[PDB]
C-alpha cells in the first residue's frame, strides 16, 4: 500500500532482535548472535484492499 523508509533507532533495533530470536527456534543457520540493523529499513502499511 503506502511504502516509506524509516530510521534505525531502538525501534528498528528491536525488530532486529525479534527476527534473530525467531530464526533461532527454527535454526536452519545453526544458531546466531545478533549484532546490529543497518540502513535501509523499509515499512509497508497495508489498508482495506487486497
Amino acid at each position: 500500500g503506502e511504502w516509506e523508509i524509516i530510521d534505525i533507532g531502538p525501534f528498528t533495533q528491536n525488530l532486529g532482535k525479534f527476527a534473530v530470536d525467531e530464526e533461532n527456534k527454527i535454526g536452519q543457520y545453526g544458531r546466531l548472535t545478533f549484532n546490529k540493523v543497518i540502513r535501509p529499513c523499509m515499512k509497508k502499511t497495508i489498508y482495506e484492499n487486497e
Binding site: G1, I6, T12, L15, G16, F18, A19, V20, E22, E23, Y29, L32, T33, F34, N35, K36, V37, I38, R39, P40, C41, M42, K43, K44, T45, I46, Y47, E48, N49, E50
Partner: protein, 44 residues
C-alpha cells in the same frame, strides 16, 4: 494478518553476516510474525 497492519523489510547483522528479514505486524493485536529470513546477502 489483516490488510491493516505493517510489514517491514530489514537488513540484520548477526554473527558478522548480513541477512534479509521481512516481519509482519497486526494493527490491532501488535502481533508480530517472522516471515522470511534469508542470507547471507551482499551489502547494499
Amino acid at each position: 494478518r489483516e490488510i491493516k497492519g505493517y510489514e517491514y523489510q530489514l537488513y540484520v547483522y548477526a554473527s558478522d553476516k548480513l541477512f534479509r528479514a521481512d516481519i509482519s505486524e497486526d494493527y490491532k493485536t501488535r502481533g508480530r510474525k517472522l516471515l522470511r529470513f534469508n542470507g547471507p546477502v551482499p551489502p547494499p
